Amino acid sequence: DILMTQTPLSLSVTPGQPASISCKSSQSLLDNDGKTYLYWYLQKPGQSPQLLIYEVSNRFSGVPERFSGSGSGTDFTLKIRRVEAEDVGVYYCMQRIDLPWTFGQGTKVEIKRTVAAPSVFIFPPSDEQLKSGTASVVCLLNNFYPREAKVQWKVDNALQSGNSQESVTEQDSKDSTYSLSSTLTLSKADYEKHKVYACEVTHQGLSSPVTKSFNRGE
């Protein structure tokens, strides 16, 4: 198979600034017929892939002019002249000079906005859910940038490990922020054996960690 490697895998772009994405193929994409079978796709969040560039350098109809491609042989570059919010998503190159057709692994593009600290909320487990045998504790991080953040669960001052899961939204079109949930799951019995439940949030927009706490049953 032909290997297609994109660099970088992720790009944070100030609005209006350019972005460049490289694609390297393990073999030449120039066929004996003079055509070069390199194509560029964009998949917006929750959408099907859409074609941007065909044969290295040609714009599919209706694709904005700020998208351009260049390169030859084994090395190709996609350039976005002035990145907008609509350009957020994952960019793939694709070859079809050889079977199988293969894609690069994809380059994620997000908007780089000013730092925004998250709002933090903690939710104790439901009384309905406690009737069922499981306790779920939710910590919510709302409207923050950048996407990176450390969420730590502490139960009676003891750090929790391996019993929580995180989920993060796609970048918000309105303000270019993210939101995030971290869910601590314990059995009902383990939950009732402890008192203090806290999630601690570390983020670039916080000069000191933010802690949200509750005592079980209060």
Asked if residue 41 lies in contact with residue 52, where contact means CB atoms within 8 angstroms, the answer is yes
Is 62 a binding residue for another protein by CB under 8 A? The answer is no
Is 198 a binding residue for another protein by CB under 8 A? The answer is no
Residue 198 tokens read as 């806290």
Sheet of 158-159, strand order: 158-159, 150-155, 196-202, 210-215
Q: Which is nearer to another protein, 33 or 65 (CB)?
A: 33
Q: Which is nearer to another protein, 44 or 82 (CB)?
A: 44
Q: Which is nearer to another protein, 82 or 216 (CB)?
A: 216
> Which residues are registered as beta bridge partners of 13?
111
**Long-range contacts: 96-101, Cβ < 8 Å, 24+?**
96/37, 96/39, 97/2, 97/27, 97/28, 97/29, 97/30, 97/31, 97/37, 98/1, 98/2, 98/27, 100/1
- Interface pick for another protein out of 31, 75, 84, 156 (rule CB under 8 A): 31
Is 138 a binding residue for another protein by CB under 8 A? The answer is yes
Q: What are phi and psi of 29, to 5 degrees?
A: -100, 0
Q: In angstroms, give the least distance from the CB of 17 to another protein.
A: 26
Ramachandran category for residue 188: left, alpha or beta (phi over 0 → left; psi -120 to 50 → alpha)? alpha
Candidates 77-85, 100-108, 152-160, 188-196 — which segment interacts with another protein by CB under 8 A?
A: 100-108
Q: Which is nearer to another protein, 14 or 126 (CB)?
A: 126
Residue 212 tokens read as 């949200």
Q: Which is nearer to another protein, 63 or 82 (CB)?
A: 63
Site residues for another protein per CB under 8 A:
1, 31-33, 37, 39, 41, 43, 48-51, 54-55, 58, 60-61, 90, 92, 94, 96-106, 119, 121, 123, 125-126, 128-129, 132, 134, 136, 138, 140, 142, 165-169, 179-181, 183, 185
